[PDB]
Design a protein around this ligand. Structure first.
Ligand SMILES: N[C@@H](Cc1ccc(Oc2ccc(O)c(I)c2)c(I)c1)C(=O)O
Ligand SMILES: N[C@@H](Cc1ccc(Oc2ccc(O)c(I)c2)c(I)c1)C(=O)O
Lengths: 116, 118, 116, 118
């Protein structure tokens, strides 16, 4: 499982579940092509977006539908969505955990890059 | 100033100096159009991007070139850049401060929205 | 496992391993009595600090030896240590995950409070 | 000002107003002694805690009463308070800005250290 997403809610101290997430790969054109997609589980986690054969070196975009999540809660958010953009290079392709902690007016994100 | 940007560095505990920033407005054809550009000062601040008149209701994108900053320091960061996407001035005109705290594998961002003086 | 600690390194995008952690419980006197203690694993995690019988309602302190961690890396840190202080109340006692992301000059912390 | 505190609220995207702050200095008997006290202003800032003269080398503790702030809003937060512990002025005198970004179950803190003007 080369790419995983974890989202937490900072307002309630709990995972952020049923959060929509879209992954994009940079194309020739420099446009963005749809790649992988899901909704976070009960544990705020998303896995099995891709495989080690399909996940090659290149530029990816991870888009988190944060605004949908706050609306659902009756809270007016600042952000349209949270985007994370990185090169999936490093050594060669590896094990990426993209995590995001959310607040109505803020967000933090970190990457944990480990090889077993 | 209706739009102000503040960038800090978490590795050194100082302002992030000469950091490039690009602002875009979502166009009618649903395209991102260049709106304004600049670099952080000595205090990690960016002022004078726009005017109250110019800053109408819409969807804005603030892209911060975090990648070029870390490279200049000898670090190879994870992110290509930090982008902040929001709707502005949709319930009357406000003042926006977008702040970012940067690390090589992480970043945090918050906004302060204020109601102009009348 | 009523209380778990997870620590990540924001400079390197990896767990923060071999990080010393001390837990304290508020005493009668209002002093702090030693309670639980460990070192984070390879995954930056610490578990089995206590049991559901010993973990009763009260005030706890979680002290993370961050300065030791940066020194070891040849990096001069700001902080003497990172402290987290909370009431282990909520409903009755529950499932607490205390997480911390570290930078030489900053730190963020969040609590995830879930009941299975 | 050698020591300045800035607190922001992440739920509302505004400064954290009337937040109490207590500063301590580790004593010789290895006890925490009260050093200074105050409340954040309208801009979420706290100034005038101490003087260059008074602010000697030592170990300081900045305790922020985050618990009382959230209660005042109708929220029951996780933390009892936010504490920042650091060594100050140990390689000559500097200026310190401690900033905190607050949420009910989380907080983030960073420092900006500057070399005085001479
Ligand atoms: N546990 C995962 C990833 C993950 C996700 C969220 C986290 O908490 C925080 C705590 C504070 C923050 O600002 C942020 I962003 C995240 C942490 I620490 C780690 C793994 O290691 O595989
Ligand atoms: N001076 C600026 C804003 C500004 C900048 C950095 C800050 O610290 C932190 C501390 C933690 C964070 O995650 C972040 I993002 C910022 C804070 I609080 C506020 C203004 O008045 O608008």
């Amino acid at each position: 499982c080369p790419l995983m997403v974890k989202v937490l809610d900072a307002v309630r101290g709990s995972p952020a579940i049923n959060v929509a997430v879209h992954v994009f790969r940079k194309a020739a054109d420099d446009t963005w092509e749809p790649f992988a997609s899901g909704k976070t589980s009960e544990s705020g986690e998303l896995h099995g977006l891709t495989t080690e054969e399909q996940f090659v070196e290149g530029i990816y975009k991870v888009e988190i539908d944060t605004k949908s999540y706050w609306k659902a809660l009756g809270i007016s958010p600042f952000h349209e969505h949270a985007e994370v953009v990185f090169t999936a290079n490093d050594s060669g392709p590896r094990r990426y955990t993209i995590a995001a902690l959310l607040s109505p007016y803020s967000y933090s994100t970190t990457a944990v890059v480990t090889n077993p």
